[PDB]
Amino acid sequence: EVKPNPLQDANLCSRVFFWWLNPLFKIGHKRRLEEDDMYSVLPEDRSQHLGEELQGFWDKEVLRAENDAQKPSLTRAIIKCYWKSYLVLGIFTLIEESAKVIQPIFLGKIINYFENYDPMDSVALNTAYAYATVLTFCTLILAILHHLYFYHVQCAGMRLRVAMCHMIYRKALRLSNMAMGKTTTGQIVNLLSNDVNKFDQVTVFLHFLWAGPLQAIAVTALLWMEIGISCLAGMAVLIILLPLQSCFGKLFSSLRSKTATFTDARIRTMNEVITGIRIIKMYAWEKSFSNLITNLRKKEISKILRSSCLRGMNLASFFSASKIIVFVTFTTYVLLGSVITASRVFVAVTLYGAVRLTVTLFFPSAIERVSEAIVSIRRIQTFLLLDEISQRNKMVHVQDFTAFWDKASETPTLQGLSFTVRPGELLAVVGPVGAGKSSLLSAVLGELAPSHGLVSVHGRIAYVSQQPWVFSGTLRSNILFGKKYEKERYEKVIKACALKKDLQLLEDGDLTVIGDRGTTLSGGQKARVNLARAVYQDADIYLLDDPLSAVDAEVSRHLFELCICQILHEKITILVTHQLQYLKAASQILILKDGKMVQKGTYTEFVGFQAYKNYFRAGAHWIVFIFLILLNTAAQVAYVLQDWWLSYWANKQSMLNEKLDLNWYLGIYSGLTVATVLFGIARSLLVFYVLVNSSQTLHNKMFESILKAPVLFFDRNPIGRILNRFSKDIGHLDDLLPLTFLDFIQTLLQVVGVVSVAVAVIPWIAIPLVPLGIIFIFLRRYFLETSRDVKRLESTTRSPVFSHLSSSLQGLWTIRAYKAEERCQELFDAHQDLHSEAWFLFLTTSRWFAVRLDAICAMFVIIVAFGSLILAKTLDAGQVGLALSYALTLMGMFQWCVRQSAEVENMMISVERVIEYTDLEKEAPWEYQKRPPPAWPHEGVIIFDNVNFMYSPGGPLVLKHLTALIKSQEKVGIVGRTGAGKSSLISALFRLSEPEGKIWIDKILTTEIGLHDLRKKMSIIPQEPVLFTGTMRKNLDPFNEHTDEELWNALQEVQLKETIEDLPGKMDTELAESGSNFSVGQRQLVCLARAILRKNQILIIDEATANVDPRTDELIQKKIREKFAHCTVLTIAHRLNTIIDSDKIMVLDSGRLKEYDEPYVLLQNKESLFYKMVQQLGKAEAAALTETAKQVYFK
Ligand SMILES: CC[C@@]1(O)C(=O)OCc2c1cc1n(c2=O)Cc2cc3c(CN(C)C)c(O)ccc3nc2-1
């Protein structure tokens, strides 16, 4: 075994404590870990073994189902597989529940000793030590041996999950093409990504389905023997809490899906902002999108906050549920007239303290997780019952072949086809079009079957689809594609593929790892690899579907004239290519149409504290948190004082020889119950409000930072990187972190409850508390330095599994062509177990930590129990019963406290990323001092003086010293080399980066006005037109300052009015995604309509009409020159004929003004680049251009 696994040989008292895992933490404390530091899985965890074993039952089970004439049952099959195993772990669950319930009874007798106390009876004292001893071992069961057990219940989960990933993939290769036609990859990948993943989460709780109810019965029976019928009072109320928890579960799922619509509506609208940002800014339409995102968020926040109230009240039930069921029990019990006594109260408090989790949380969860598992199985069953291809599947013969992609009602995909070919001969095929162009090959592969006629083949087939496909590994590994390596074969074919030079020049040699999803190769080179793979296999049958042979290249000739015509030509081969002239070398040509063989037409026939501060300060004044800190303690102190008051009552009562004032004691006691639920519920609402209001603020402080971010921000940051923060992180700050934080705080108080009660009742506990503390601090620090990293490795090692299935599910034909399932199965198993190696660490890592938290927690109970008995002269029965009833309660809650601590610390990083967006360097203000006068653009005069511009500070100067005059209403065409200068002068004109030099517009220096004062007052028509998901009215005027008449005129200025007024909303029609119902030219016509609405005296055309039919461009040209006669127009355009009649042209290259004059005068200088560019037209049209330019003198 490559990575020997210590679990093979660790002794019991190693693996009980996971002591064997110690070396991992040592190294993980010294280093960052890597995939070689993780252990290999034990033999039985191998995907192949589990799958082959489970098939060994599911196979039998479908045999039964056919023989019994019923639909089969996968749930029975896994059960029949795991029954003989999984029952054994039930035995520990049984003894575990016993320990949970037995502890109270002996907590009775150890308290009972104090009720009978005399300092001088050693015999009674020794009995108490025996009870205290068994109380320790009972704790030791729950606190130590529980952890090995829980790991094995987790292993039932992981073992079951892995086996399904095997059987699914095994099915996926056997899957019939029809079933693949009835399927999408996303279904199988999701099934593997999620729906099998549920099998861990059922198995942790499946034993609670019986052990929980059996627990509840036992607790009621015991209590009845302690407190009579009165135990029915609490237990019935406890059981009523079970539906009530479900009632909350129902509601927020409703409101969660109700909020889903708005995060989707927000995130789509946000994605338009982030991707569209540049053109958004030029229009000055921030305020439009600012209103949308604000209103959706303010809508979203209202429902998520209204859900947050119910989510808060839910935890308040978990806070009061012990206190309510205690109160009603003893109140009834007292009203049936019993005195209250320390022994009989704390037993019930402890029995309730034990059962409460089982009925209120584990069992409610379990019935849900079982329900999600059983639905997961039934779809997996559905998948495993899809149809399959017939798995059995020197010469090739075909005869009258009549076949379909599916037996739909249309005519067969192949019809009447017959041929035979023998080795040493090449067929070629003019195949179908609009359909399976290589359908003939697909028949030879047996992807299709005859309704009539026959195909017969012998030997082994090589195939390539015209679609390329590349396997996970190196390119050499793809050239091997699992076959043995053979240097001379490999050399000869790889050289005959001319691949070495390209592979050396472009892909670093054959050792190059093929990257994620095949990223590494160019598609042109990727295509050739398929043939290189094919030829390396030296198969009997070589089937070629157009390998971009249609692409003219020396290799696409060389492969044929040397390799395919001479080397490969000995083998059986069939070729489809557009290279019809290659088929002059073909031995035979088949031409096909409508599946018919139409002719044998042979060719000759032709995180630091500051994060917390920032997050909380964003919620409220610190004065509010002071009010909040009061409520926390008030809830917690009300909680403890209730149980202390119950002790105090018992202590007074047992002192009497005479009546108690029932309505004093029960009065105050009832008060603390009402108080503890009321502060508890109030606290639980307040925390959410403070934190959720904090999330709302961070979004709005952050969202404004995004609109006012300069374009430079969106150059450096990918769209996904930004948009993820608006989906994921602010998702968490609404969905889950306020919840997780309140649950952390709630539990932390309760731990502070037990510890502080314990030191109060027994002061000298305060000494050993500090050792336990410092032990915990070093433990947490030592642990999390590793666990943080294992979770990284686990999350990483997941991604090859889905990638491999996706790649393999894309390659199905090819895999079965090489009948290579026997290996590709092994590749999946290699990936699956390597993830399982990480999952095995993830399970056992947490236990090695969790067992110590329960170790030091187990040590605490010892301290209180024997500490109480040591101080027996001083303590008194009520106070001990308080201390011990709390001490037992620590066991469960303390582990949960630190789990949420780790999860909050991890999740809190989402807040750091959000705040890092709250302070991005802004542009200058939109509105600024020295506002331009009320009609400032009144001439369209522009000066550029020594203008210098860059896409980054200190970057390359893409404008150098650019200096120009543009006169009023002048029409300035601009052109240059492709990619030279480009829009940079436009982005300078919008100040999207601040230019050096000066730009003056209508006597105003552009660098001394607000960016909306500028950008509102100049139109642009962009390189790519943009529509926004919204009304046609908003896409034309979000401010609705233009009349519908003007909006109709604009749509009537273009052709499109009578294509929009017939849409049901008319101007108010909101569009499909990206306006798919409109053509690209029509989207530019929308920008022209926008421009026609704006009627600014300045317009910029950015090369737009290259997307558009010239006849629509002709309309654009017409309407520009008609409508913008008074306007000043700048026009970057590639084809000079669009601009040949400009009053002047600027030509830019290398960032310099190569030319600026009347275009004919530029042509009149035969040295000019403009003349040269017109001469580079290479055509007599240069004369028509020249004449048209000269006419500008005279027309
Ligand atoms: C749901 C997770 C889990 O089942 C688990 O994976 O392992 C076992 C375990 C769990 C949860 C909780 N606990 C556990 O031991 C203890 C616990 C206490 C909780 C408390 C405090 N209790 C004293 C009521 C809460 O307020 C809210 C949620 C709580 N959840 C849990």
Curated annotation (Swiss-Prot):
Protein name per its UniProtKB record: ATP-binding cassette sub-family C member 4
Q: How does it sit in the membrane?
A: Multi-pass membrane protein
Where do transmembrane segments lie in this chain?
Answer: 87-107, 130-150, 201-221, 222-242, 322-342, 345-365, 426-446, 621-641, 672-692, 737-757, 759-779, 855-875, 878-898, 939-959
EC numbers: 7.6.2.-, 7.6.2.2, 7.6.2.3
Enumerate the residues binding ATP 2: 976-983
Q: What PTMs does it carry?
A: N-glycosylated; leading to substrate-selective effects on its transport activity.
The protein's gene is named: ABCC4
Q: Which organism is it from?
A: Homo sapiens
Q: Which reaction does it catalyse?
A: ATP + H2O + xenobioticSide 1 = ADP + phosphate + xenobioticSide 2; an S-substituted glutathione(in) + ATP + H2O = an S-substituted glutathione(out) + ADP + phosphate + H(+); 17beta-estradiol 17-O-(beta-D-glucuronate)(in) + ATP + H2O = 17beta-estradiol 17-O-(beta-D-glucuronate)(out) + ADP + phosphate + H(+); dehydroepiandrosterone 3-sulfate(in) + ATP + H2O = dehydroepiandrosterone 3-sulfate(out) + ADP + phosphate + H(+)
Protein's cellular compartments: Basolateral cell membrane; Apical cell membrane
Q: Which GO terms describe its biological process?
A: bile acid and bile salt transport; cAMP transport; cilium assembly; export across plasma membrane; leukotriene transport; platelet degranulation; prostaglandin secretion; prostaglandin transport
Impact of changing residue 298 to N on the protein?
Transport properties comparable to wild-type
Residue span(s) of domain ABC transporter: 396-606, 942-1175
Q: Name one GO cellular component term.
A: Golgi apparatus
Query: According to the UniProt record, what happens if one changes residue 767 to V?
Result: Transport properties comparable to wild-type
Give glycosylation sites per the record: 657
Q: What is the effect of changing residue 542 to C?
A: 40% reduced expression level compared to wild-type; higher transport of 9-(2-phosphonyl-methoxyethyl) adenine than wild-type
Q: What result follows from mutating residue 755 to F?
A: Transport properties comparable to wild-type
Cite the ABC transmembrane type-1 domain residue spans from the record. 86-371, 625-906
Tell me the subunit arrangement.
Interacts (via PDZ-binding motif) with SNX27 (via PDZ domain); this interaction accelerates MRP4 internalization.
Provide the alphabetized UniProt keywords: ATP-binding, Cell membrane, Glycoprotein, Lipid transport, Membrane, Nucleotide-binding, Phosphoprotein, Repeat, Translocase, Transmembrane, Transmembrane helix, Transport
InterPro entries given in the database record: AAA+_ATPase (IPR003593), ABC1_TM_dom (IPR011527), ABC1_TM_sf (IPR036640), ABC_transporter-like_ATP-bd (IPR003439), ABC_transporter-like_CS (IPR017871), ABC_transporter_C-like (IPR050173), ABCC4_TMD1 (IPR030240), ABCC4_TMD2 (IPR047083)
Q: Which positions in this protein are listed as binding ATP 1?
A: 431-438
